[PDB]
Motif scaffolding. Structure first.
Motif, mmCIF file in Angstrom:
data_model
loop_
_atom_site.group_PDB
_atom_site.id
_atom_site.type_symbol
_atom_site.label_atom_id
_atom_site.label_comp_id
_atom_site.label_asym_id
_atom_site.label_seq_id
_atom_site.Cartn_x
_atom_site.Cartn_y
_atom_site.Cartn_z
ATOM 1 N N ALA A 289 4.031 26.648 65.603
ATOM 2 C CA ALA A 289 4.590 26.796 66.939
ATOM 3 C C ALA A 289 5.893 26.032 67.011
ATOM 4 C CB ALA A 289 3.678 26.270 68.045
ATOM 5 N N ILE A 290 6.776 26.504 67.878
ATOM 6 C CA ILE A 290 8.079 25.892 68.087
ATOM 7 C C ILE A 290 8.243 25.741 69.585
ATOM 8 C CG2 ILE A 290 10.563 26.040 67.560
ATOM 9 C CD1 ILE A 290 9.891 28.063 65.426
ATOM 10 N N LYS A 291 8.883 24.655 70.011
ATOM 11 C CA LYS A 291 9.153 24.421 71.424
ATOM 12 C C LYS A 291 10.556 23.865 71.572
ATOM 13 N N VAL B 231 17.437 20.035 70.492
ATOM 14 C CA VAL B 231 16.563 20.061 69.328
ATOM 15 C C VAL B 231 15.526 21.165 69.444
ATOM 16 N N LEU B 232 15.091 21.673 68.293
ATOM 17 C CA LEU B 232 13.895 22.492 68.177
ATOM 18 C C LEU B 232 12.808 21.642 67.543
ATOM 19 C CD1 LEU B 232 15.277 25.879 66.930
ATOM 20 C CD2 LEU B 232 14.268 25.433 69.128
ATOM 21 N N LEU B 233 11.616 21.718 68.102
ATOM 22 C CA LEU B 233 10.526 20.879 67.673
ATOM 23 C C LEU B 233 9.375 21.763 67.262
ATOM 24 C CD1 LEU B 233 10.668 18.403 70.654
ATOM 25 C CD2 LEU B 233 11.601 18.051 68.386
ATOM 26 N N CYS B 234 8.901 21.627 66.037
ATOM 27 C CA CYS B 234 7.762 22.424 65.697
ATOM 28 C C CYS B 234 6.710 21.624 65.017
ATOM 29 C CB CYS B 234 8.050 23.509 64.706
ATOM 30 S SG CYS B 234 9.203 22.653 63.640
ATOM 31 N N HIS B 235 5.612 22.317 64.815
ATOM 32 C CA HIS B 235 4.346 21.728 64.511
ATOM 33 C C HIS B 235 3.665 22.830 63.730
ATOM 34 C CE1 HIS B 235 0.493 19.993 64.861
ATOM 35 N NE2 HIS B 235 0.094 20.601 65.962
ATOM 36 N N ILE C 246 5.028 17.901 61.633
ATOM 37 C CA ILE C 246 6.106 18.141 62.586
ATOM 38 C C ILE C 246 7.448 17.877 61.915
ATOM 39 C CG2 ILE C 246 4.567 17.438 64.448
ATOM 40 C CD1 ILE C 246 5.598 15.058 62.952
ATOM 41 N N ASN C 247 8.491 18.500 62.460
ATOM 42 C CA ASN C 247 9.783 18.370 61.807
ATOM 43 C C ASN C 247 10.504 17.099 62.211
ATOM 44 O OD1 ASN C 247 10.151 19.435 64.410
ATOM 45 N ND2 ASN C 247 12.198 20.152 63.839
ATOM 46 N N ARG C 248 10.212 16.555 63.381
ATOM 47 C CA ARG C 248 10.870 15.343 63.864
ATOM 48 C C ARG C 248 9.820 14.324 64.274
ATOM 49 N NH1 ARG C 248 16.431 15.487 65.217
ATOM 50 N NH2 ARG C 248 15.963 13.298 65.596
HETATM 51 S S1 LIG Z 1 10.842 23.830 64.186
HETATM 52 C C1 LIG Z 1 12.318 23.152 63.286
HETATM 53 C C2 LIG Z 1 12.846 23.969 62.012
HETATM 54 C C3 LIG Z 1 13.728 24.839 62.406
HETATM 55 C C4 LIG Z 1 12.924 26.144 62.737
HETATM 56 C C5 LIG Z 1 13.590 27.424 62.128
HETATM 57 C C6 LIG Z 1 12.920 26.431 64.285
HETATM 58 N N1 LIG Z 1 11.509 25.821 62.157
HETATM 59 O O1 LIG Z 1 10.964 26.744 61.747
HETATM 60 C C7 LIG Z 1 11.698 24.867 61.265
HETATM 61 C C8 LIG Z 1 10.423 24.114 60.888
HETATM 62 C C9 LIG Z 1 12.270 25.341 59.915
#
Ligand SMILES: *SCC1=CC(C)(C)N(O)C1(C)C
Ligand SMILES: *SCC1=CC(C)(C)N(O)C1(C)C
Ligand SMILES: *SCC1=CC(C)(C)N(O)C1(C)C
Lengths: 134, 134, 134
Positions: free
Chosen positions: C83-85, C61-65, C113-115
């Motif tokens: 930010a993304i982690k 998973v990618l997790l961002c905020h 946050i996305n998740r």
């Molecule tokens: S952080 C999850 C999602 C995918 C990604 C491109 C990494 N993010 O920018 C969003 C919020 C779109």
């Protein structure tokens, strides 16, 4: 509002370099603060809150991020805030730094990373550097 | 400038302990704030910005970092800000915490980690703890 | 003390959602700032320090905020800070964002946050969102 303030952001079109810009929306460079040779120049003595974030990205090193002070009097770079992070789908790694410091008139501040080629500024708000006099 | 302020930094010669110091260059302890028993003592009621960073290092655990409040009235530690991170070449891991809080006169604040033996303060600006009255 | 200020914290009993609360101890919503539809509403124009932290947790998973601005005039969300982690024993991952911005009266801010199903608010001080007029 007459407090010295800056909130500068990475130039998204620079390649392999962390070049700070103020002439973007939601960025600031006001009330005496200057951006000269990629560093922020302090207009007056006082306590400043100083902060910065970088985002790194890769796919498939030690990465650090530092804010340093150049004193007008002593022309040598001292780290004020520093962090190091150790990291085919992509990976991302943010670093945040922030603290309060007494600065004198004419001090320069730089926010630097060791590998600009790892930076990700594909989207707004990812890489930034600011100060506010308090 | 009469605002309560502190920006303290880890003692680089302490072994296995996070001991905060103000008598370093680019550190501060001014306008009523005290450092007593490794905690910051608040001189007056009001809103304070409170922050801290730690850097962890290893080679070849859960690591956390908390700022807590001891109320003068209720002598019990409440976490204000807390974070946890899960991690032969070396690895590094920073944690940053910061927020604004209403504090009362005489409150003590501590910035604590669970494994001081993992801290890295080999260089300036890596581990710090500050407050500013706002 | 008449500065607009908010420091809101995640509702620990929400399931799969990041719902901000002010009616907790060591949280704030004072001097004009409003919490409406999970966003912070700015009472007056000026420079604000804006910040937020999330903590993610998993096991095995990618997790961002992001903090975004809705301008009262232009009803569209701009990212101010993001930010993304990239991440069976448990793992934890914090993200911190903070910066200074000029805001206008009636702007709304969200910290998202996305998740949300990955969030950990098992303990106080882990997930928070604040502003202070400066
Ligand atoms: S952080 C999850 C999602 C995918 C990604 C491109 C990494 N993010 O920018 C969003 C919020 C779109
Ligand atoms: S962060 C990259 C580089 C190597 C290391 C010793 C980890 N850093 O301090 C510098 C900036 C020198
Ligand atoms: S961070 C180390 C320790 C274990 C855990 C439950 C993850 N933390 O909360 C404490 C401080 C108790």
């Amino acid at each position: 509002s007459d407090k010295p303030v800056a909130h500068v952001v990475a130039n998204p079109q620079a390649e392999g370099q962390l070049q700070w810009l103020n002439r973007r929306a939601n960025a600031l460079l006001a009330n005496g603060v200057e951006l000269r040779d990629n560093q922020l120049v302090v207009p007056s003595e006082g306590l400043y809150l100083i902060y910065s974030q970088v985002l790194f990205k890769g796919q498939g090193v030690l990465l650090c991020h530092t804010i340093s002070r150049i004193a007008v009097s002593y022309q040598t770079k001292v780290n004020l805030l520093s962090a190091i992070k150790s990291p085919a789908k992509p990976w991302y790694e943010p670093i945040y730094l922030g603290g309060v410091f007494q600065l004198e008139k004419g001090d320069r501040l730089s926010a630097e990373i060791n590998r600009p080629d790892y930076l990700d500024f594909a989207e707004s708000g990812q890489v930034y550097f600011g100060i506010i006099a308090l």
